[PDB]
Design a protein around this ligand. Structure first.
Ligand SMILES: CCCCCCCCCCCCCCCCCCCCCCCCCC(=O)N[C@@H](CO[C@H]1O[C@H](CO)[C@H](OCc2ccccc2)[C@H](O)[C@H]1O)[C@H](O)[C@H](O)CCCCCCCCCCCCCC
Ligand SMILES: *[C@@H]1O[C@H](CO[C@@H]2O[C@@H](C)[C@@H](O)[C@@H](O)[C@@H]2O)[C@@H](O[C@@H]2O[C@H](CO)[C@@H](O)[C@H](O)[C@H]2NC(C)=O)[C@H](O)[C@H]1NC(C)=O
Ligand SMILES: *[C@@H]1O[C@H](CO)[C@@H](O[C@@H]2O[C@H](CO)[C@@H](O)[C@H](O)[C@H]2NC(C)=O)[C@H](O)[C@H]1NC(C)=O
Ligand SMILES: *[C@@H]1O[C@H](CO)[C@@H](O[C@@H]2O[C@H](CO)[C@@H](O)[C@H](O)[C@H]2NC(C)=O)[C@H](O)[C@H]1NC(C)=O
Ligand SMILES: [Cl-]
Ligand code: NA
Ligand code: NA
Lengths: 240, 271, 200, 98
């Protein structure tokens, strides 16, 4: 199980800003590789390295600098970020064999300006009594609203542990003001459980939205709170 | 009469971009194939260069090599990047491959690789390996080339089966060219050398084995210095034997030449 | 591009088989690898084909390769909902790290799930903190029903979505609608089943 | 980086006025990039055939340049070789006596 990690996993950056995508690998692989994934294309190689100190140009190196300071770490550096570098970036490693072991991916969005960036409000809607008696099932509904851009990860948590069973989230967020250019987004998710499970008042339910926005170092001139990368969640306890 | 078959390859890499690869193939001292960088296909230099392979068998084989040449060029380029900055351009690589045919359907194949004019690597058994004298950095190239199982299986089949089969066919198809007998012509001349030096020229003979001695009557001169075998353009050989003597001593000396083509009637040239 | 996949996308019902095609011009062609990419996630290797006329299998996934034709197919037997993914074909031109990988653009598979016993209904759910606010949950309808957006732009309706309560082996469609409006008049623009339960 | 040996010789016994082939055999050189000219009275002969380059067991390169010529008492024939190993080009004149 030769695993590879990437950080960050999701990033919002401004044009002309510096962005550094990192890749760690503990498998003692000499060889590491950087790809980006775009619609209409397969993965395309940007930069690769045969060992610490070496960097070699791929097929689409323009706009990127690579860096292999150690055997473990391989970085992709966007010196001056541009909207065209909006993509999903995959790192990989391998030994002398043909197999490349891929990381989980990094989603990068490069905006013209950060003025419209805003975190979500989150509301948890409790199951209806009608549904409970009719199905012997209880559907919680989470609602993330008023956020920009659309880089959010909505997750469900029961008693401090993440639940996947009985969950589905909108494949993409809908626009609140489709007419406007920089519309805020809304996202919904449902968690269905048995009525008896929801009826247990020791079960603590929480909808968590991981918002990706500005960092500490990003400049901010507006009066409202700085729309930084953050979590917003809503919660409720079970009841008979 | 053990004929050695040699597939000689020369590859030159001036920098990252520019490179060229040219090959020639010898069965004994006769050229059978030529492959210029410029050419997309292997060229016969004899009527019988295809041997006893069918057109279909030759196409398959040629295609294998066509892929090889392109692949090899990129591999060396990548291997340089891998060792960088330990090794740098310009780089010269040579390959000597083929099989040595013995009687009784016996042979022994080989694949030797030189780097910057030094024999560093060979294919032995079922893998690439370094030879004594090789620098230790080549162990990463060798590890990488030995990762490629497909290349290993192919070269194994190429050295073990394809070479002896093909060369055994060549020997049948090119029998009359291999066993040909070309007669030498001889001529005499002299120059000073610190005392004059008599030169006996012998040119246009095939095959390579030849006997040339200066003689006074029936007295083999011990001072006869045989030179190297120099080739002619028509695939015949040139040899000269020199004898250092004193002025006024040239009278009596003759150059005797024995060769299989002459068949008893040795050439005897008197000064 | 040296690696073309077909079809570009396809839709199948749960239980059905599908065949995915990969055609390449890569020279040489050492090996061919099939990946699975769930929406958002990374690349999961399904199988790898190496021989001239190779065949492989991985549970429900089986594949073949013909190097003479430069053709490979991935067969998925008895599709499940979780097969909803992009399937990516990659050819490697070496049997070592000296190789470059040649990637296909992918094939999008959607698997429409089999809803066992439908029970369509529209419920009203209340916010845990501020009880005045609410959403409308249209749920437990079959796959043949289509949820359209509202005429009013102040009313928001999501696309339909399917969840899977794994322990019970139960699946259900749902869509959410909200505004700032009643649930009775929420999904009017959608053609909903006539036996749709509207509670009091 | 080995330095090239050069050897000039005629195919047939040399007779004045009588057509013949003149050979230039360059050997023992490395690297294989080389320029070989055959000269008549210091001027470059046109249409000089060149054998394909090859190498011996010791990995040293060789090549046989040859051309048609008619020897006279006046005309001088030579072989001029430029190689990276040599600072200046090495010229080797033909001598029928040698
Ligand atoms: C050799 C005797 C032949 C006698 C018979 C024929 C005679 C007729 C005249 C022909 C004249 C030809 C002139 C050329 C003569 C010199 C060449 C002699 C040496 C032959 C070597 C051929 C190598 C063949 C393989 C090859 O092309 N490798 C290529 C391509 O390989 C790919 O494509 C294959 C398709 O066949 C296969 O995939 C198919 C496959 C997959 C799975 C299973 C089975 C198959 C492989 O797996 C896949 O990786 C590969 O790139 C090799 O690495 C090339 C380099 C090999 C020589 C390296 C020498 C050592 C160099 C050391 C460097 C040190 C310096 C570093 C800075
Ligand atoms: C091919 O033959 C080799 C043995 O022949 C030697 O290596 C060739 C490449 C060539 O250089 C010949 O002249 C040599 O005599 C086989 O190698 C042996 O394989 C066995 C089993 O795989 C292994 O146990 C031995 O260690 C190998 N022998 C040596 C000396 O290393 C090889 O298996 C043959 N391959 C095929 C496909 O026929
Ligand atoms: C790579 O090397 C080649 C071959 O040496 C270079 O081409 C030569 O360039 C010089 C000029 O400095 C000329 O005198 C030669 O005639 C050229 N030779 C050939 C065969 O073209 C080439 O410029 C080099 N390329 C790079 C990018 O460095
Ligand atoms: C030797 O042959 C190779 C392979 O044909 C040449 O590489 C090609 O060069 C041409 C012209 O520069 C390009 O159009 C092709 O894209 C190249 N092909 C490949 C596969 O790389 C190489 O230039 C030749 N070298 C010399 C010095 O003639
Ligand atoms: Cl891409
Ligand atoms: Na979750
Ligand atoms: Na219901």
């Amino acid at each position: 199980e030769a695993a590879v990690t990437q950080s960050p996993r999701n990033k919002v950056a401004v044009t002309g800003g510096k962005v550094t995508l990192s890749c760690n690998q503990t498998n003692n692989h000499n060889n590491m590789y950087w790809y980006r994934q775009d619609t209409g294309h397969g993965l395309r190689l940007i930069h690769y390295s045969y060992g610490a100190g070496s960097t070699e140009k791929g097929d689409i190196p323009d706009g990127y600098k690579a860096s292999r300071p150690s055997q473990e770490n391989f970085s992709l550096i966007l010196e001056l970020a541009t909207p065209s570098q909006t993509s999903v970036y995959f790192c990989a490693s391998g030994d002398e064999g043909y197999t490349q072991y891929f990381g989980p991916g990094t989603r990068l969005l490069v905006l013209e300006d950060l003025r419209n960036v805003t975190p979500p409000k989150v509301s948890l809607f409790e199951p209806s009594k009608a549904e409970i008696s009719h199905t012997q099932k209880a559907t919680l509904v989470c609602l993330a609203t008023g956020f920009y851009p659309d880089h959010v990860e909505l997750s469900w948590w029961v008693n401090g542990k993440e639940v996947h069973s009985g969950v589905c989230t909108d494949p993409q967020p809908l626009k609140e003001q489709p007419a406007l250019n920089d519309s805020r987004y809304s996202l919904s998710s449902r968690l269905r459980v048995s009525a008896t499970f929801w009826q247990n008042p020791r079960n603590h339910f929480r909808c968590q939205v991981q918002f990706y926005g500005l960092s500490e170092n990003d400049e901010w001139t507006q009066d409202r709170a700085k729309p930084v990368t953050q979590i917003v969640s809503a919660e409720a306890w079970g009841r008979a | 009469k053990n004929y050695t078959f040699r597939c000689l390859q020369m590859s030159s890499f001036a920098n990252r971009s520019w490179s060229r690869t040219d090959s020639v193939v010898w069965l004994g001292d006769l050229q059978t194939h030529r492959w210029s960088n410029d050419s997309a296909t292997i060229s016969f230099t004899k009527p019988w260069s295809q041997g006893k392979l069918s057109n279909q068998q030759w196409e398959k084989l040629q295609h294998m090599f066509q892929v090889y040449r392109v692949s090899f060029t990129r591999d060396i380029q990548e291997l340089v990047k891998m060792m960088s900055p330990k090794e740098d351009y310009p780089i010269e690589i040579q390959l000597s491959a083929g099989c040595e045919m013995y009687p009784g359907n016996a042979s022994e194949s080989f694949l030797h690789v030189a780097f910057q004019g030094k024999y560093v690597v060979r294919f032995w058994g079922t893998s690439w390996q370094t030879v004594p004298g090789a620098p230790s950095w080549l162990d990463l190239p060798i590890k990488v080339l030995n990762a490629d199982q497909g290349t290993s299986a192919t070269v194994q089949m190429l050295l073990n089966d394809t070479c002896p089969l093909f060369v055994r066919g060549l020997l049948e198809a090119g029998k009359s060219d291999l066993e040909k007998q070309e007669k030498p012509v001889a001529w005499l001349s002299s120059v000073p050398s610190s005392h004059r030096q008599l030169v006996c020229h012998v040119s246009g003979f095939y095959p390579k084995p030849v006997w040339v001695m200066w003689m006074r009557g029936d007295q083999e001169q011990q001072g006869t210095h045989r030179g190297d075998f120099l080739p002619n353009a028509d695939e015949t050989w040139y040899l000269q034997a020199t004898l250092d003597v004193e002025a006024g001593e040239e009278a009596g000396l003759a150059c005797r030449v024995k060769h299989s083509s002459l068949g008893g009637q040795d050439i005897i040239l008197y000064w | 591009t040296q690696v073309e996949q077909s079809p570009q996308s396809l839709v199948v019902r749960q239980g059905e088989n599908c065949v995915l095609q990969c055609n390449y011009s890569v020279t040489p062609d050492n090996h061919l690898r099939w990946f699975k990419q769930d929406t958002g996630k990374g690349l999961v290797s399904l199988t790898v084909l190496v021989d001239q006329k190779d065949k492989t299998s991985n549970g429900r996934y089986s594949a073949t390769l013909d190097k003479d034709a430069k053709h490979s197919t991935l067969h998925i037997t008895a599709t499940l909902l979780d097969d909803t993914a992009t399937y990516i074909c990659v050819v490697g031109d070496r049997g070592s790290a000296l190789g470059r990988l040649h990637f296909g653009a992918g094939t999008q598979l959607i698997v429409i799930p089999d809803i066992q016993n439908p029970d369509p209904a529209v419920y009203q759910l209340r916010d845990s903190k501020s009880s005045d606010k609410s959403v409308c949950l249209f749920t437990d309808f079959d796959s043949q029903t289509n949820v359209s957006q509202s005429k009013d732009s102040d009313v928001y309706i999501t696309d339909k979505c399917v969840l899977d309560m794994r322990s019970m082996d139960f699946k259900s469609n749902s869509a959410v609608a909200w505004s700032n409006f009643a649930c009775a008049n929420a999904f009017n623009n959608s053609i909903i089943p006539e036996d749709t339960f509207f509670p009091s | 980086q080995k330095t090239p040996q050069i050897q000039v010789y005629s195919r047939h016994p040399p007779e004045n006025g009588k057509p013949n082939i003149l050979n230039c055999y360059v050997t023992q050189f490395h690297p294989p990039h080389i320029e070989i000219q055959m000269l008549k009275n210091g001027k470059k002969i046109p249409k000089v055939e060149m054998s394909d380059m090859s190498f011996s067991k010791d990995w040293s390169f060789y090549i046989l340049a040859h051309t048609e010529f008619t020897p006279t008492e006046t005309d001088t024939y030579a072989c001029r070789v430029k190689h990276a190993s040599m600072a200046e080009p090495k010229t080797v004149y033909w001598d029928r006596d040698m």
